[PDB]
Amino acid sequence: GSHMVGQREPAPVEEVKPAPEQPAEPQQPVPTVPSVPTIPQQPGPIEHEDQTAPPAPHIRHYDWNGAMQPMVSKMLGADGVTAGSVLLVDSVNNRTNGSLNAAEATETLRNALANNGKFTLVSAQQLSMAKQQLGLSPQDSLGTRSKAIGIARNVGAHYVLYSSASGNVNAPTLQMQLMLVQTGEIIWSGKGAVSQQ
């Protein structure tokens, strides 16, 4: 508000005489005009993947040893079996009321088979493989004498221990069965209700 007010004018129209010129000072010396351009539609990342990979959950644990051991103990007292054989422990089946880690069982097989000492246990390094080599899974079980015999001989075994679980999955009947691989006949069999660990 520096000057340029002219408070209390006379009455007749008149230009401000107590002011020679005093021009209106420029607010901005720049005669510039801002400008914002529209942004074109840029695409986003596609990012493809490389085939889905099933995480695959984990199963319980059963006291398979509680099932196998007493049976393994019988299996070697079976007619057809001999101490000192390599016993192709088959995958345990899971025929139960549900789903179980019969491969866990099948491991326990070897284990219960191991504790009784009269056999020579094959490793899944052979067995599991053989199953796959032949078709199956280390879990699927041989399911078929010749599939068993295939594996057992592909594995280096004298026998087969056909095992399974039925009844109730949480606590199944471990239905076991000792197939001679060299003939494919059932020389021993059993069942034993396994526990959940």
Q: For residue 147, what are its two tokens?
A: 């599939």
Exp. method:
NMR
Q: Is residue 23 part of a domain?
A: no
Segments forming the whole domain that contains residue 193: 60-197
Tell me the C-alpha distance between 129 and 152, whole Å: 11
Q: For residue 182, what are its two tokens?
A: 């060299």
Q: Is residue 6 part of a domain?
A: no
Task: Give yes or no for a contact between 97 and 125, defined as CB atoms under 8 angstroms apart.
Answer: no
Tell me the C-alpha distance between 42 and 16, whole Å: 61
Q: Is residue 165 part of a domain?
A: yes
Distances (CA, A) of 67 to 24, 140, 150, 158: 106, 19, 26, 22
Element housing 88 (H / E)? strand 85-92
Rounded CA Rg of the chain:
44
Tell me the C-alpha distance between 104 and 150, whole Å: 22
Q: DSSP character for 124?
A: T
> Residue 183 carries which side chain, given as an amino acid letter?
T
Number of Cβ within 10 Å of residue 58's Cβ equals 8
Q: Is residue 88 part of a domain?
A: yes
CATH of the domain at 149: 3.40.50.10610
Count of CA atoms in the C-beta half-sphere (13 A) of 190: 21
| Number of residues in the chain | 197
Task: Give yes or no for a contact between 189 and 76, defined as CB atoms under 8 angstroms apart.
Answer: no
Locate the DSSP E strands across 60-171: 62-63, 85-92, 119-121, 159-166
Tell me the C-alpha distance between 105 and 68, whole Å: 9
The total number of structural domains that make up the chain: 1
Q: DSSP character for 165?
A: E
Q: For residue 70, what are its two tokens?
A: 């007493």
Q: Is residue 191 part of a domain?
A: yes
